[PDB]
Write a protein that binds this ligand. Sequence first.
Ligand SMILES: N[C@@H](Cc1ccccc1)C(=O)O
Ligand SMILES: N[C@@H](Cc1ccccc1)C(=O)O
Ligand SMILES: [Cl-]
Ligand SMILES: [Cl-]
Ligand SMILES: [Cl-]
Ligand SMILES: [Cl-]
Ligand SMILES: [Cl-]
Ligand SMILES: [Cl-]
Ligand SMILES: [Mn+2]
Ligand SMILES: [Mn+2]
Lengths: 346, 346
Amino acid sequence: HYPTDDIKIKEVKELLPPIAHLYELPISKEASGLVHRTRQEISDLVHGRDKRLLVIIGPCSIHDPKAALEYAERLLKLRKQYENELLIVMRVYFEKPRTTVGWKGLINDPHLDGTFDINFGLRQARSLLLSLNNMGMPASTEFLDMITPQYYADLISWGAIGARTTESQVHRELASGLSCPVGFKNGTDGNLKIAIDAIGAASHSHHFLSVTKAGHSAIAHTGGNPDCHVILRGGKEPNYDAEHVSEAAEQLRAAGVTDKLMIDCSHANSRKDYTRQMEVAQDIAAQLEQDGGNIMGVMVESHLVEGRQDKPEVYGKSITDACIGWGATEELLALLAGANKKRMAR
Amino acid sequence: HYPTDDIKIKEVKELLPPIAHLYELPISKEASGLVHRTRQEISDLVHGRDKRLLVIIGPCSIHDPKAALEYAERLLKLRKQYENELLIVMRVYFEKPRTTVGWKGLINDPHLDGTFDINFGLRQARSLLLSLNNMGMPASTEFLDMITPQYYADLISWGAIGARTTESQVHRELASGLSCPVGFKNGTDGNLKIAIDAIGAASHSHHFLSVTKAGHSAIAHTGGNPDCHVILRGGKEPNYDAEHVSEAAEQLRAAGVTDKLMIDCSHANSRKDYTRQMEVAQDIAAQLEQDGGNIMGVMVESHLVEGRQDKPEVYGKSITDACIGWGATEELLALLAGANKKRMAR
Ligand SMILES: N[C@@H](Cc1ccccc1)C(=O)O
Ligand SMILES: N[C@@H](Cc1ccccc1)C(=O)O
Ligand SMILES: [Cl-]
Ligand SMILES: [Cl-]
Ligand SMILES: [Cl-]
Ligand SMILES: [Cl-]
Ligand SMILES: [Cl-]
Ligand SMILES: [Cl-]
Ligand SMILES: [Mn+2]
Ligand SMILES: [Mn+2]
């Protein structure tokens, strides 16, 4: 009798179920009001009901809950100051997907040492998200799989499906059942169609496999997500400018989906140079001053300290993509608030 | 207290765990030997140690186990007849991923009527796979998610990650732990790099979330999969010809991964026209006669009856992509067998 099962598996280890973390860290009354309201505010932006700019801003990845909370405290002041022009939501992404060998993020490997203490990682992810909402800072994240949302999606005000998963049927099915609005990124080489197609798909009811909150194999039946939009994040060429926004809006309309979209200032639009994010934001500011009617949001990679590092030596400095630092963050946000004030007054 | 959990979920229903199906339908000694042997035979083709041609052939999707078994019985005679030139493995894909609304396949919706009887679908998929292997026909399939493999991957001799999921980090992580060899398709717009990158990534150890055989939330830690290869399946233009093969092989060598590849005769290489699969097969046959050193396999969509239908009225006729019929299948296999006999004698 020859073996055929789990030939290339080292082990399969059962995790604590979502309900265990939910019981210790239940969503508070206050956090629930913030999440519910922020989801609605974002829906309003996606559908053109409000002309504030959604700003998804924060670290490329979270590797240190302390620095994340300090960052949130600073950002909250600006979220409040600019609340009439900008809707500021913090980036709380636990991982950056990659092709080469590297750190697999705070959920999978919280101790940053290849121990893969995932129960600890999931608990800390949830705890950080609860603390953020409790202080008044809504949180955004990317869902890379169909199981992690059960642990903490209740704390998430906006979700992303990245460039590498926007075309994936199962990630579209997930999005169709996410409680938050969802942005779909264009493809890594610039393909917009996959994201336009994703919005249409995700608006419908789907099924996908996952686990129940008690941790048991399950099929989820979704209602459809009416609050999806595209995210322009560059490709072979950047796609942040007015001509690209116009072309995207035309294609969105031709597909019968929302022509309000988000522009990522980072990643392929900055050509991985954090100092380009301000130049992208300047371009967006000019678009908002002139017309800019199809822009509902921007994404920015921002941390306490600018740049990046291979090892987590400097506090508040990214170990994944390079970020703008705090002073630049202040200037970028001022810029976009000033420009959108003018758009909103028209 | 505002609601924030499962806002856009109709229901999340617990499934029977993998172990329930495994208990009723354990892999037999005979099936286990066939799977183990066929996996090794394929590895030898991936790594150029044998020059038979892997032929992944059969329906686009399985919607009727009876027709599938009848198909397998006819195909088995040709698998044996051509065993010195070809390694024939049946296509046993339960679903066609799609953007628009439609049937979600035999696992998700076995009764072909929107009832989504997934426990019955999983049981029927496993039962069919066990029956196939027991009759001496190995099976191939596409894994669309990270949970279905626990139900029946032990019965699969070759697995696909399709064009829409090749770039997905989690599907690459899955691949790195699949017991079978795995083919990664180039992107829907012809992008080959995502598949070359996938081979590299899948060769390493990874973690991903799934369920245990007992059905509980789990983390799987993989050992890496050394038996991955690319599948040329077209883009905007077909990519099956000798120039395209040569360019792909060159790219594969540069990345330091296997330069033996598979060519899909269907989907975008046929320009979605089932009557053009034979043209692609004839082109491949000519490459094999001249040189064709980098070709280790082909994929063909084939059924009892040619064409497609929207409703499952005609027995043995596809309700997803159109397939060549049985007569044309005999012709196509004869052609490839004849051509590869000459390549192997060189
Ligand atoms: N609980 C998730 C939706 C979901 C359900 C089941 C599995 C996965 C995701 C949400 O509220 O967004
Ligand atoms: N059981 C699968 C591997 C796997 C394990 C766990 C989860 C998903 C897939 C195989 O033998 O190929
Ligand atoms: Cl993102
Ligand atoms: Cl990106
Ligand atoms: Cl395939
Ligand atoms: Cl890649
Ligand atoms: Cl297990
Ligand atoms: Cl395909
Ligand atoms: Mn980043
Ligand atoms: Mn098909």
